[PDB]
């Protein structure tokens, strides 16, 4: 597994998993592991249709160190 | 439940004067020549403009007035000019002689060389496209009954286009109007399909079969009365068809054995025409009129009875497919492509059933007397029933991006596709490759066989045979049907299974085909064509939305030429593309069926009989032991058969000669628009806009290069163009001159 | 050469005349173009070869369609033309282009028959061209 | 990876950040242009070569390029 | 220049090269390209503005 | 003026060029069947 992606909901919606698909997000903080960066930021952008701007991507070394590369800040 | 709405769109020549009023983008005046093209592109792509399904949906229904209308005008011409320009009159005095013929060519520079001797002293173009089989079927006797159904097709063109004003300028409906598809299924399957057929053996019973069994006594054409004195004289429809007097009562009081003269099952072919039995037609769409009589009646309108489609649909689930068929009801009742997809997936293979239910089975008296008729129907229906296939997959993309919504189909089965559509691609391109190998590898394994000079290690009827089992036996199952599993009737449902050689004068209407270590190949080349033509359009279906490569591929949208030169290269991506790669595959699948009809029928069906029963064949029986070799797909088929078209100048296959050469051209020219890259051209022309801007000639519409997408249709629309008028015009000249 | 013998001492061509097609309904239009290609010349094959050299008693296969046809091409050229130069200074000029101004485009129209007088005038005007200053190049 | 530059004629535009979808870009300010910012690519090993950055640049020619170099397992957008 | 002065560019990677534009803004301090020249015909991008230095133009009006 | 609206759009491109060039292919169609087999021209 590698860059782990969470964001905070208001609530339960069903939104579209980047790998084909849907699934339901819960209410409160969420985590999906996903293959790349690049789906984490095309499902960035599908959180923002939902008034969503809180979502963190992480990066999960095969040694366990976890990287936070989005945002910088 | 009819809510109108009054005059929402004025009648005026307004917009008619400003070019792309539609869209908001395109309407502000073109600065390039790409505008010029995507004018005529967005043009009925109605559902671009607003979220209004209800503004929408009122300009599909009124359009769809405007297809029938050029339809009838279409039909109603080919009846006109069948009346003025034709033989009709001189062909039914004797079919077996005189060819079909209309189009008469106006002399000016020589083109009246294609009028040439059809027989009966008439000189025009032998057409193929078989309207008087179709016209002696309808009962048609004389010109002034085809000037009649001419003008009467002409005032309802007029019909159909004046209520496409109405429905859409004056009183247009609303949206809940469309939506009671519980209440169009019943109108539709009751009125149109059923109560249509139960009119049309109406005109079977008391019309057609009178004359057509009149015709095949051989008494005269103008002897033979006038259809509605069938009627009035009730005399006549007592010499023939002597179950006629008992009267409608028979009807009511079930003695329906009584109708047992012309409402037959006799089960075969008509030896006088070749065609089916006229009164067998009769007991046919009567009982097709039954059927849809009571099958309407199922889905719920206002008075409480019947079914309702979101409670069947959601009843049918199971524990595999979670929940199973729950919100396609949604999907299908607020998309127009969904529906769009699914009426025309089905509908277009409907038409190659149509094609293999009509060679077959000859409906028509003399088709298949006439070899350059029946070849011609099928392959026609053919190509047209393979583009709607490929028109349902790509408005099935186009569903996916823009009109998919997760809440709808949230587990049910559309979304459990997308969920392992790893797997059913994967698998399906291992069968794609399965099929490649144990199909088309037969075939190079007999080239190289025989080229080497080994003929007993080939794949044939002589050194190892490859017979088809599973299709050997269900031959002899519909040879012995009847007395068996349908006593009643008493040949069978046609001859192409068992029976017998039923000729016609000396030509063959259908003998019994018998399939062999050729026809093993061939009919697993048609599976391996097929299959890989699903997996590029489904490709185009479940990676429409995402992929691993791009994770938002439905936010670039359906039609989108690539994502750049990075990921390795990502162009032809889109959901567009895949309909563009699949069109080639489905012509070169077609084209295959084609062919594999055009010379099992010349070589194994049709020829002429002789005296004592001898069928000599037209190739003379050449399909067993060179259908197996690609050198022999090319020398006696290709090579072989066009030997008349290529030697067809100074005679009237000229057009024939110059089609075939032109569609060479043309083929060969869209490989310059598939070959080459946007990018280049664009380049070219800044080199010729200069000289443009050098003598003060400079556009103010700048000149632009096609664009990626449209060069890539461009060059699939004039290499299917060119590609398939090379077999249209190869087809005609070598049949028209050997049947 | 090769035998471009005149067409009316042909045997070949001779030949080629009994057995003629009639072009139009006219029931002798085969004959009425076989009198009139005697003066070509056929070679051994019967078929009239067109003479492009210039010479005068062959000025009908080439000579006299040059002039005629580039009279006519040169024509549509000059109009073609002429109301790229009107519509420039108008309004818009875009709605000029695929919308024609019927108004402008019909004098141009009629104008253009003394465009050699017109494009000798233009030439000599130094208004024909541009300058190379004031159009757009590729960089080199 | 890949190597993108950006030259100073951009605007701060801000079209080119809002358009890489693998977040190579980002805005720093800037006292030149009218916006007071430029674009910056900090993280062009994730860079995918998309030239989505390019497409969208308003300024003719382009301030930011995107030069196509050796493509590690980052760039090629492998998943696998 | 001033707001409508028609100008020329020299800058050779532009797709407006030795054409006529039209000044739509000079601004004060800041970008050194502080010229807004709206052009009358487009680019590949599809747009017709741009910016340009002082130096740049060449006045024809 | 509905009636500048038809001036209009017998004046745009395609309509325009319909009607030009069936005048020029009706001019070359109809002076060969009068004048057919013009090879050359006779001197
Ligand atoms: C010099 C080129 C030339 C010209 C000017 C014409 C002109 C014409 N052709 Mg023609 N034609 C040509 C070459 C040409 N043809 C060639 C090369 C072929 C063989 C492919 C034909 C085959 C052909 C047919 C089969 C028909 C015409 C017809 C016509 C007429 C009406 C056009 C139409 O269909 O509407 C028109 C007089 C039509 C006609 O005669 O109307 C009755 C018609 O049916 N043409
Ligand atoms: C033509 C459609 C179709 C097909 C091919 C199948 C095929 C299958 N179903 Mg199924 N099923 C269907 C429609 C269909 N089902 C519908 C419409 C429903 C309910 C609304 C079900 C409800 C159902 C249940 C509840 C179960 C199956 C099971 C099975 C499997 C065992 C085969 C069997 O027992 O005979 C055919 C069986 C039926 C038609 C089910 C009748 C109840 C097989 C894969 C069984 C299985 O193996 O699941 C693990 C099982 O437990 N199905
Ligand atoms: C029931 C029939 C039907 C209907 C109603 C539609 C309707 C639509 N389709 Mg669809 N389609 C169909 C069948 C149908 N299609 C089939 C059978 C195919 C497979 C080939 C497709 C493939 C297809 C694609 C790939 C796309 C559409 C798109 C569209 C939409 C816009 C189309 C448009 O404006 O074209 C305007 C008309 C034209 C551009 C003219 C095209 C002319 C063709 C290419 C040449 C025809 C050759 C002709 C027979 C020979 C002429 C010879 C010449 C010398 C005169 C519209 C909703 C497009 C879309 O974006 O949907 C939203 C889109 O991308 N369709
Ligand atoms: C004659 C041309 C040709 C050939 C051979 C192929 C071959 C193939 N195409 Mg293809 N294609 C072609 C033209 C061709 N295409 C064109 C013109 C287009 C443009 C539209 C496409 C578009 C296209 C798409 C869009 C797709 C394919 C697919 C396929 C594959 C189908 C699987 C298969 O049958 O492989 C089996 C191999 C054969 C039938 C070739 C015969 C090989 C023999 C039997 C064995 C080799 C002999 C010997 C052992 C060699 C070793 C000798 C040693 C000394 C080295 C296969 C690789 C599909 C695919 O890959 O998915 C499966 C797919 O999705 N093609
Ligand atoms: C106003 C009309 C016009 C005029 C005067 C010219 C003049 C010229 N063109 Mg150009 N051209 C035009 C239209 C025109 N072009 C159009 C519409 C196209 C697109 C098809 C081209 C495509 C083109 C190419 C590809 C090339 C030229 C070239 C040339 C030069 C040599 C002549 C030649 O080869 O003809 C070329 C002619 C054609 C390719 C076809 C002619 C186009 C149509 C048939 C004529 C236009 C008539 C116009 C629509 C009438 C409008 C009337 C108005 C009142 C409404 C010369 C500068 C060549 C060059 O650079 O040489 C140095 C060259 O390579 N042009
Ligand atoms: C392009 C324009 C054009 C021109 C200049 C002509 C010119 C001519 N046509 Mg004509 N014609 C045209 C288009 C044209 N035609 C078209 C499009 C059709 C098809 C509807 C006809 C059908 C037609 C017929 C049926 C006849 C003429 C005849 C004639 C001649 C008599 C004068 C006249 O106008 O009538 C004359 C040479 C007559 C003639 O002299 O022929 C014997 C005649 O009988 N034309
Ligand atoms: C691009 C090359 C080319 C060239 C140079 C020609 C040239 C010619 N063709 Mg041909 N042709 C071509 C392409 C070409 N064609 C193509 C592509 C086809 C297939 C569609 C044909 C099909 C064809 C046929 C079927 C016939 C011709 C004919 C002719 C001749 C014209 C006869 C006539 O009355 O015109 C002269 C016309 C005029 C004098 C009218 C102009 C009057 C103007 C407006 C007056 C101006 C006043 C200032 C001429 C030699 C005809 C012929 O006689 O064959 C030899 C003929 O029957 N051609
Ligand atoms: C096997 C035929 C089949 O349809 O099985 C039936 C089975 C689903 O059967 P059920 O009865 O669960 O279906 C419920 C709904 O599909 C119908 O309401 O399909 C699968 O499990 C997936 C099929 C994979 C197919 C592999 C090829
Ligand atoms: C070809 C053509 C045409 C023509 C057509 C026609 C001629 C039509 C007709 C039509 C018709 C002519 C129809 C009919 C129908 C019928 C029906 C539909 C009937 C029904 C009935 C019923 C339903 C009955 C029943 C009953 C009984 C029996 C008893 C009890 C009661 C009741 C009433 C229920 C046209 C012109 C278009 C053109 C195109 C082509
Ligand atoms: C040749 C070619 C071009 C250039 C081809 C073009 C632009 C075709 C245009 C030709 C027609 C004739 C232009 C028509 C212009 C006017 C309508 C001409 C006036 C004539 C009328 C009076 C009939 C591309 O733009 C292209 C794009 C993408 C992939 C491949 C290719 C490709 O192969
Ligand atoms: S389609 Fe052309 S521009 Fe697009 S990725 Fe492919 S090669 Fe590059
Ligand atoms: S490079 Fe392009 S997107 Fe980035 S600031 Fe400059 S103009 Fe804007
Ligand atoms: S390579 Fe181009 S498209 Fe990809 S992130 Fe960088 S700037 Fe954006």
Same mark, same amino acid.
């Given at each position: 597994?590698?860059?782990?992606?969470?964001?905070?909901?208001?609530?339960?919606?069903?939104?579209?998993?980047?790998?084909?698909?849907?699934?339901?997000?819960?209410?409160?903080?969420?985590?999906?592991?996903?293959?790349?960066?690049?789906?984490?930021?095309?499902?960035?952008?599908?959180?923002?249709?939902?008034?969503?701007?809180?979502?963190?991507?992480?990066?999960?070394?095969?040694?366990?160190?976890?990287?936070?590369?989005?945002?910088?800040? | 439940?009819?809510?109108?709405?009054?005059?929402?769109?004025?009648?005026?020549?307004?917009?008619?004067?400003?070019?792309?009023?539609?869209?908001?983008?395109?309407?502000?005046?073109?600065?390039?020549?790409?505008?010029?093209?995507?004018?005529?592109?967005?043009?009925?792509?109605?559902?671009?403009?607003?979220?209004?399904?209800?503004?929408?949906?009122?300009?599909?229904?009124?359009?769809?007035?405007?297809?029938?209308?050029?339809?009838?005008?279409?039909?109603?011409?080919?009846?006109?000019?069948?009346?003025?320009?034709?033989?009709?009159?001189?062909?039914?005095?004797?079919?077996?002689?005189?060819?079909?013929?209309?189009?008469?060519?106006?002399?000016?520079?020589?083109?009246?060389?294609?009028?040439?001797?059809?027989?009966?002293?008439?000189?025009?173009?032998?057409?193929?496209?078989?309207?008087?089989?179709?016209?002696?079927?309808?009962?048609?006797?004389?010109?002034?009954?085809?000037?009649?159904?001419?003008?009467?097709?002409?005032?309802?063109?007029?019909?159909?286009?004046?209520?496409?004003?109405?429905?859409?300028?004056?009183?247009?409906?609303?949206?809940?109007?469309?939506?009671?598809?519980?209440?169009?299924?019943?109108?539709?399957?009751?009125?149109?399909?059923?109560?249509?057929?139960?009119?049309?053996?109406?005109?079977?019973?008391?019309?057609?079969?009178?004359?057509?069994?009149?015709?095949?006594?051989?008494?005269?054409?103008?002897?033979?009365?006038?259809?509605?004195?069938?009627?009035?004289?009730?005399?006549?429809?007592?010499?023939?068809?002597?179950?006629?007097?008992?009267?409608?009562?028979?009807?009511?009081?079930?003695?329906?054995?009584?109708?047992?003269?012309?409402?037959?099952?006799?089960?075969?072919?008509?030896?006088?025409?070749?065609?089916?039995?006229?009164?067998?037609?009769?007991?046919?769409?009567?009982?097709?009129?039954?059927?849809?009589?009571?099958?309407?009646?199922?889905?719920?309108?206002?008075?409480?009875?019947?079914?309702?489609?979101?409670?069947?649909?959601?009843?049918?689930?199971?524990?595999?497919?979670?929940?199973?068929?729950?919100?396609?009801?949604?999907?299908?009742?607020?998309?127009?492509?969904?529906?769009?997809?699914?009426?025309?997936?089905?509908?277009?293979?409907?038409?190659?059933?149509?094609?293999?239910?009509?060679?077959?089975?000859?409906?028509?008296?003399?088709?298949?007397?006439?070899?350059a008729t029946q070849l011609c129907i099928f392959t026609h229906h053919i190509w047209i029933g393979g583009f709607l296939i490929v028109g349902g997959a790509a408005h099935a993309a186009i569903f996916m991006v823009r009109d998919y919504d997760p809440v709808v189909n949230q587990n049910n089965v559309l979304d459990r596709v997308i969920r392992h559509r790893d797997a059913i691609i994967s698998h399906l391109n291992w069968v794609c490759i399965f099929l490649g190998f144990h199909s088309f590898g037969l075939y190079i394994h007999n080239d190289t066989m025989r080229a080497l000079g080994r003929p007993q290690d080939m794949f044939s009827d002589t050194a190892i045979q490859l017979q088809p089992v599973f299709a050997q036996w269900v031959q002899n199952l519909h040879t012995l049907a009847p007395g068996g599993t349908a006593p009643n009737a008493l040949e069978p449902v046609s001859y192409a299974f068992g029976g017998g050689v039923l000729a016609v004068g000396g030509?063959?209407?259908?003998?019994?085909?018998?399939?062999?270590?050729?026809?093993?190949?061939?009919?697993?080349?048609?599976?391996?064509?097929?299959?890989?033509?699903?997996?590029?359009?489904?490709?185009?279906?479940?990676?429409?939305?995402?992929?691993?490569?791009?994770?938002?591929?439905?936010?670039?949208?359906?039609?989108?030429?690539?994502?750049?030169?990075?990921?390795?290269?990502?162009?032809?991506?889109?959901?567009?593309?895949?309909?563009?790669?699949?069109?080639?595959?489905?012509?070169?699948?077609?084209?295959?069926?084609?062919?594999?009809?055009?010379?099992?029928?010349?070589?194994?069906?049709?020829?002429?009989?002789?005296?004592?029963?001898?069928?000599?064949?037209?190739?003379?029986?050449?399909?067993?032991?060179?259908?197996?070799?690609?050198?022999?797909?090319?020398?006696?088929?290709?090579?072989?058969?066009?030997?008349?078209?290529?030697?067809?100048?100074?005679?009237?296959?000229?057009?024939?000669?110059?089609?075939?050469?032109?569609?060479?051209?043309?083929?060969?020219?869209?490989?310059?628009?598939?070959?080459?890259?946007?990018?280049?051209?664009?380049?070219?022309?800044?080199?010729?806009?200069?000289?443009?801007?050098?003598?003060?000639?400079?556009?103010?519409?700048?000149?632009?290069?096609?664009?990626?997408?449209?060069?890539?249709?461009?060059?699939?629309?004039?290499?299917?163009?060119?590609?398939?008028?090379?077999?249209?015009?190869?087809?005609?000249?070598?049949?028209?001159?050997?049947? | 050469?090769?035998?471009?013998?005149?067409?009316?001492?042909?045997?070949?061509?001779?030949?080629?005349?009994?057995?003629?097609?009639?072009?139009?309904?006219?029931?002798?239009?085969?004959?009425?173009?076989?009198?009139?290609?005697?003066?070509?010349?056929?070679?051994?094959?019967?078929?009239?070869?067109?003479?492009?050299?210039?010479?005068?008693?062959?000025?009908?296969?080439?000579?006299?369609?040059?002039?005629?046809?580039?009279?006519?091409?040169?024509?549509?050229?000059?109009?073609?033309?002429?109301?790229?130069?009107?519509?420039?200074?108008?309004?818009?000029?875009?709605?000029?282009?695929?919308?024609?101004?019927?108004?402008?485009?019909?004098?141009?129209?009629?104008?253009?028959?003394?465009?050699?007088?017109?494009?000798?005038?233009?030439?000599?005007?130094?208004?024909?061209?541009?300058?190379?200053?004031?159009?757009?190049?590729?960089?080199? | 990876?890949?190597?993108?530059?950006?030259?100073?004629?951009?605007?701060?535009?801000?079209?080119?950040?809002?358009?890489?979808?693998?977040?190579?870009?980002?805005?720093?300010?800037?006292?030149?242009?009218?916006?007071?910012?430029?674009?910056?690519?900090?993280?062009?090993?994730?860079?995918?070569?998309?030239?989505?950055?390019?497409?969208?640049?308003?300024?003719?020619?382009?301030?930011?390029?995107?030069?196509?170099?050796?493509?590690?397992?980052?760039?090629?957008?492998?998943?696998? | 220049?001033?707001?409508?002065?028609?100008?020329?560019?020299?800058?050779?990677?532009?797709?407006?090269?030795?054409?006529?534009?039209?000044?739509?803004?000079?601004?004060?301090?800041?970008?050194?390209?502080?010229?807004?020249?709206?052009?009358?015909?487009?680019?590949?991008?599809?747009?017709?503005?741009?910016?340009?230095?002082?130096?740049?133009?060449?006045?024809?009006? | 003026?509905?009636?500048?609206?038809? $001036?209009?759009?017998?004046? !745009? @491109?395609?309509?325009?060029?319909? $009607?030009?060039?069936?005048? !020029? @292919?009706?001019?070359?169609?109809?002076?060969?069947?009068?004048?057919?087999?013009?090879?050359?021209?006779?001197?």
């Amino acid at each position: 597994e590698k860059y782990a992606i969470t964001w905070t909901s208001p609530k339960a919606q069903v939104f579209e998993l980047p790998t084909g698909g849907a699934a339901t997000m819960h209410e409160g903080e969420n985590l999906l592991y996903i293959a790349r960066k690049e789906y984490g930021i095309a499902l960035g952008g599908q959180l923002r249709k939902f008034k969503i701007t809180n979502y963190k991507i992480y990066r999960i070394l095969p040694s366990g160190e976890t990287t936070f590369i989005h945002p910088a800040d | 439940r009819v809510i109108v709405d009054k005059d929402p769109v004025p009648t005026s020549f307004e917009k008619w004067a400003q070019p792309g009023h539609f869209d908001r983008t395109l309407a502000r005046g073109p600065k390039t020549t790409t505008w010029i093209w995507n004018l005529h592109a967005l043009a009925h792509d109605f559902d671009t403009h607003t979220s209004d399904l209800e503004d929408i949906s009122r300009k599909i229904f009124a359009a769809h007035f405007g297809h029938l209308a050029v339809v009838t005008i279409w039909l109603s011409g080919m009846i006109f000019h069948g009346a003025k320009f034709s033989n009709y009159e001189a062909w039914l005095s004797d079919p077996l002689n005189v060819r079909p013929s209309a189009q008469v060519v106006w002399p000016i520079v020589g083109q009246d060389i294609l009028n040439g001797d059809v027989g009966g002293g008439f000189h025009g173009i032998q057409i193929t496209s078989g309207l008087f089989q179709v016209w002696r079927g309808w009962g048609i006797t004389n010109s002034f009954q085809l000037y009649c159904t001419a003008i009467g097709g002409l005032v309802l063109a007029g019909l159909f286009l004046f209520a496409g004003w109405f429905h859409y300028h004056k009183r247009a409906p609303k949206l809940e109007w469309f939506q009671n598809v519980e209440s169009m299924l019943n109108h539709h399957l009751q009125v149109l399909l059923g109560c249509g057929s139960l009119g049309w053996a109406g005109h079977l019973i008391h019309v057609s079969a009178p004359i057509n069994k009149l015709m095949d006594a051989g008494v005269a054409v103008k002897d033979i009365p006038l259809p509605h004195e069938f009627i009035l004289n009730k005399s006549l429809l007592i010499d023939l068809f002597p179950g006629f007097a008992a009267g409608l009562t028979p009807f009511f009081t079930l003695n329906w054995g009584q109708y047992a003269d012309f409402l037959t099952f006799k089960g075969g072919l008509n030896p006088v025409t070749g065609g089916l039995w006229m009164t067998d037609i009769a007991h046919h769409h009567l009982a097709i009129a039954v059927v849809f009589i009571i099958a309407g009646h199922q889905y719920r309108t206002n008075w409480g009875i019947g079914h309702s489609i979101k409670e069947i649909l959601e009843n049918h689930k199971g524990p595999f497919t979670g929940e199973g068929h729950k919100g396609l009801y949604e999907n299908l009742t607020t998309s127009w492509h969904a529906q769009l997809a699914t009426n025309l997936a089905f509908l277009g293979s409907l038409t190659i059933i149509i094609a293999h239910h009509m060679y077959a089975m000859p409906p028509y008296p003399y088709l298949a007397t006439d070899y350059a008729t029946q070849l011609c129907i099928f392959t026609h229906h053919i190509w047209i029933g393979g583009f709607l296939i490929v028109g349902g997959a790509a408005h099935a993309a186009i569903f996916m991006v823009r009109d998919y919504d997760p809440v709808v189909n949230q587990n049910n089965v559309l979304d459990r596709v997308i969920r392992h559509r790893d797997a059913i691609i994967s698998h399906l391109n291992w069968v794609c490759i399965f099929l490649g190998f144990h199909s088309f590898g037969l075939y190079i394994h007999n080239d190289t066989m025989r080229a080497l000079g080994r003929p007993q290690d080939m794949f044939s009827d002589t050194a190892i045979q490859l017979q088809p089992v599973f299709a050997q036996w269900v031959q002899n199952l519909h040879t012995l049907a009847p007395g068996g599993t349908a006593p009643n009737a008493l040949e069978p449902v046609s001859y192409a299974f068992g029976g017998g050689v039923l000729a016609v004068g000396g030509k063959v209407a259908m003998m019994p085909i018998a399939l062999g270590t050729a026809d093993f190949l061939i009919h697993h080349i048609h599976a391996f064509t097929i299959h890989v033509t699903v997996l590029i359009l489904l490709k185009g279906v479940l990676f429409a939305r995402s992929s691993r490569l791009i994770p938002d591929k439905a936010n670039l949208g359906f039609r989108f030429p690539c994502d750049g030169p990075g990921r390795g290269g990502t162009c032809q991506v889109s959901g567009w593309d895949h309909v563009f790669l699949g069109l080639f595959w489905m012509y070169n699948s077609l084209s295959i069926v084609i062919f594999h009809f055009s010379w099992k029928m010349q070589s194994d069906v049709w020829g002429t009989v002789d005296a004592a029963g001898n069928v000599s064949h037209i190739t003379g029986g050449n399909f067993a032991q060179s259908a197996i070799t690609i050198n022999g797909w090319l020398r006696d088929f290709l090579w072989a058969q066009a030997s008349q078209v290529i030697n067809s100048y100074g005679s009237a296959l000229s057009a024939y000669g110059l089609m075939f050469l032109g569609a060479h051209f043309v083929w060969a020219f869209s490989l310059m628009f598939l070959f080459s890259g946007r990018g280049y051209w664009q380049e070219l022309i800044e080199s010729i806009v200069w000289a443009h801007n050098k003598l003060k000639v400079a556009p103010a519409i700048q000149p632009r290069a096609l664009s990626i997408t449209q060069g890539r249709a461009v060059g699939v629309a004039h290499y299917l163009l060119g590609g398939i008028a090379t077999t249209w015009a190869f087809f005609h000249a070598h049949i028209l001159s050997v049947g | 050469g090769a035998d471009l013998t005149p067409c009316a001492e042909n045997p070949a061509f001779q030949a080629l005349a009994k057995n003629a097609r009639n072009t139009t309904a006219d029931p002798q239009s085969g004959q009425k173009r076989f009198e009139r290609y005697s003066q070509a010349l056929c070679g051994p094959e019967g078929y009239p070869h067109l003479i492009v050299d210039g010479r005068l008693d062959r000025a009908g296969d080439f000579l006299i369609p040059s002039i005629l046809f580039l009279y006519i091409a040169g024509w549509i050229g000059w109009v073609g033309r002429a109301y790229l130069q009107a519509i420039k200074k108008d309004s818009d000029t875009e709605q000029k282009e695929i919308q024609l101004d019927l108004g402008i485009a019909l004098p141009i129209i009629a104008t253009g028959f003394a465009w050699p007088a017109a494009a000798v005038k233009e030439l000599l005007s130094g208004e024909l061209t541009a300058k190379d200053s004031e159009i757009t190049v590729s960089p080199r | 990876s890949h190597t993108v530059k950006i030259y100073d004629t951009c605007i701060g535009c801000t079209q080119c950040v809002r358009a890489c979808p693998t977040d190579v870009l980002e805005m720093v300010p800037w006292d030149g242009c009218k916006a007071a910012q430029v674009a910056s690519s900090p993280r062009t090993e994730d860079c995918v070569g998309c030239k989505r950055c390019e497409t969208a640049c308003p300024t003719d020619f382009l301030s930011i390029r995107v030069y196509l170099g050796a493509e590690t397992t980052r760039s090629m957008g492998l998943a696998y | 220049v001033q707001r409508g002065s028609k100008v020329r560019i020299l800058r050779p990677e532009s797709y407006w090269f030795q054409d006529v534009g039209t000044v739509a803004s000079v601004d004060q301090s800041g970008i050194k390209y502080p010229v807004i020249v709206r052009f009358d015909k487009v680019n590949y991008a599809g747009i017709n503005t741009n910016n340009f230095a002082v130096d740049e133009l060449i006045e024809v009006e | 003026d509905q009636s500048s609206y038809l $001036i209009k759009f017998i004046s !745009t @491109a395609p309509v325009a060029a319909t $009607i030009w060039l069936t005048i !020029t @292919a009706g001019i070359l169609i109809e002076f060969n069947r009068f004048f057919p087999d013009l090879l050359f021209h006779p001197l």
